[PDB]
Write an enzyme that holds these catalytic residues in place. Structure first.
Site, mmCIF file in Angstrom:
data_model
loop_
_atom_site.group_PDB
_atom_site.id
_atom_site.type_symbol
_atom_site.label_atom_id
_atom_site.label_comp_id
_atom_site.label_asym_id
_atom_site.label_seq_id
_atom_site.Cartn_x
_atom_site.Cartn_y
_atom_site.Cartn_z
ATOM 1 N N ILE A 24 -18.921 40.724 43.898
ATOM 2 C CA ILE A 24 -19.325 40.384 42.546
ATOM 3 C C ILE A 24 -19.659 38.911 42.493
ATOM 4 O O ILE A 24 -18.775 38.076 42.634
ATOM 5 C CB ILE A 24 -18.232 40.630 41.511
ATOM 6 C CG1 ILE A 24 -16.890 40.158 42.040
ATOM 7 C CG2 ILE A 24 -18.201 42.087 41.096
ATOM 8 C CD1 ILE A 24 -15.894 39.938 40.941
ATOM 9 N N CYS A 25 -18.857 34.229 48.810
ATOM 10 C CA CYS A 25 -18.366 35.498 49.321
ATOM 11 C C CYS A 25 -17.102 35.887 48.574
ATOM 12 O O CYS A 25 -16.003 35.590 49.001
ATOM 13 C CB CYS A 25 -18.093 35.371 50.807
ATOM 14 S SG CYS A 25 -19.082 34.077 51.586
ATOM 15 N N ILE A 26 -17.272 36.531 47.432
ATOM 16 C CA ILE A 26 -16.149 36.943 46.612
ATOM 17 C C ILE A 26 -16.170 38.446 46.410
ATOM 18 O O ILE A 26 -17.167 39.000 45.991
ATOM 19 C CB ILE A 26 -16.209 36.240 45.248
ATOM 20 C CG1 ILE A 26 -16.175 34.725 45.435
ATOM 21 C CG2 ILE A 26 -15.081 36.698 44.350
ATOM 22 C CD1 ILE A 26 -16.475 33.948 44.180
ATOM 23 N N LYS A 46 -11.551 35.768 47.733
ATOM 24 C CA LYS A 46 -12.588 34.840 48.125
ATOM 25 C C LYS A 46 -12.402 34.521 49.582
ATOM 26 O O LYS A 46 -11.333 34.146 50.004
ATOM 27 C CB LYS A 46 -12.496 33.550 47.316
ATOM 28 C CG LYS A 46 -12.717 33.740 45.837
ATOM 29 C CD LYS A 46 -12.349 32.492 45.063
ATOM 30 C CE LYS A 46 -13.329 31.368 45.321
ATOM 31 N NZ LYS A 46 -13.303 30.384 44.209
ATOM 32 N N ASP A 152 -15.392 18.390 36.535
ATOM 33 C CA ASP A 152 -16.631 19.170 36.417
ATOM 34 C C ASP A 152 -16.535 20.304 35.415
ATOM 35 O O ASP A 152 -17.030 21.393 35.664
ATOM 36 C CB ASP A 152 -17.047 19.718 37.787
ATOM 37 C CG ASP A 152 -18.556 20.030 37.885
ATOM 38 O OD1 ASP A 152 -19.342 19.737 36.956
ATOM 39 O OD2 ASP A 152 -18.968 20.574 38.921
#
EC number: 2.7.11.1
Length: 316
Positions: A24, A25-26, A46, A152
């Site tokens: 949904i 590299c996860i 992950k 962030d």
């Protein structure tokens, strides 16, 4: 390079078992069971190469600050309804095809706020903005008290609880910064082992000046998001290819907040809680502990002003 056979069972460092699902590299993840991992899975796994720097950084933050019981205890003691720090569920090392990977299990979420913002013609109401910002202040207080700044904050890093659209969570700690290891604040200087300046339109003046991010910078970033969310714009949005321009505007607008309000809001029609918020952040020294509750109470006046209250409704 598929890091996992879909539906395989992986065990983390503490021997807890998990099943891996579709991406949904996860990838979608859940507790080990006879049943397959579904679309409604509560977790994600992950995976990155073991030499990936950001994953290690993010994992350390999660181990240190996002232990399930650690978070629940904070929620209970500070009498919050929830806390938007994702929960850490485990991690380990996974070798595949003669390469080494690191994996981490964490909470799964629904939509990011940026998709929702864009679907709303790039506006959130004053109600929505104040409610979001109250909970972000709860989040920032928590991570700051556990020695980290995020650097962030932005809508694409804010995800809704997939089972509750009134709870928002702050994600992505791959470039988070440990500003206060063992209670010793970093000096007002650059960090050689840190490359990131945040996202250009939202980042702090500190970050623009090449100094490691601190607590005041996070509150400043949130300030700029609030204006972006309310109005659809920031003044410097035309010239983001020039960080010199962006810093220059930021510095000049910090020096005169009334002109920021005049520029960003129509006429003589600017929400005073936002101006007060920014005036308060402006008074912070680099190493200074924010008075988070004062900041929240400033936002509460905005809600009182519009005939509302802190009822937890994000109203998205």
């Amino acid at each position: 390079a598929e890091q996992f056979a879909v539906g395989e069972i992986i065990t983390d460092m503490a021997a807890a078992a998990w099943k891996v699902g579709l991406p949904i590299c996860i990838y979608l993840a859940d507790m080990n069971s006879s049943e397959s991992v579904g679309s409604d899975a509560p977790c994600v796994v992950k995976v990155e190469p073991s030499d990936n720097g950001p994953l290690f950084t993010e994992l350390k933050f999660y181990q240190r600050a996002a232990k399930p019981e650690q978070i629940q205890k904070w929620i209970r003691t500070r009498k919050l309804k929830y806390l938007g720090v994702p929960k850490y569920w485990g991690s380990g090392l996974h070798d595949k095809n003669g390469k080494s990977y690191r994996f981490m299990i964490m909470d799964r979420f629904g939509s990011d706020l940026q998709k929702i913002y864009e679907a709303n013609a790039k506006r959130f109401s004053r109600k929505t903005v104040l409610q979001l910002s109250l909970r972000i202040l709860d989040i920032l207080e928590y991570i700051h008290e556990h020695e980290y700044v995020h650097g962030d904050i932005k809508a694409s890093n804010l995800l809704l609880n997939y089972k509750n659209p009134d709870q928002v969570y702050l994600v992505d700690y791959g470039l988070a910064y440990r500003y206060c290891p063992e209670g010793v604040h970093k000096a007002y200087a650059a960090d050689p082992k840190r490359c990131h300046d945040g996202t250009i339109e939202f980042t702090s003046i500190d970050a623009h000046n090449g100094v490691a991010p601190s607590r005041r910078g996070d509150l400043e970033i949130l300030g700029y998001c609030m204006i972006q969310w309310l109005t659809g714009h920031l003044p410097w949005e035309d010239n983001l290819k020039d960080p010199k321009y962006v810093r220059d505007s930021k510095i000049r607008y910090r020096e005169n907040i009334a002109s920021l309000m005049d520029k960003c809001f129509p006429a003589a029609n600017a929400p005073g809680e936002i101006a007060k918020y920014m005036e308060t952040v402006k008074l912070l020294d680099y190493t200074e502990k924010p008075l988070y509750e004062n900041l929240r109470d400033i936002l509460l006046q905005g809600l009182k002003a519009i005939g509302s209250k802190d009822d937890g409704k994000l109203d998205l």
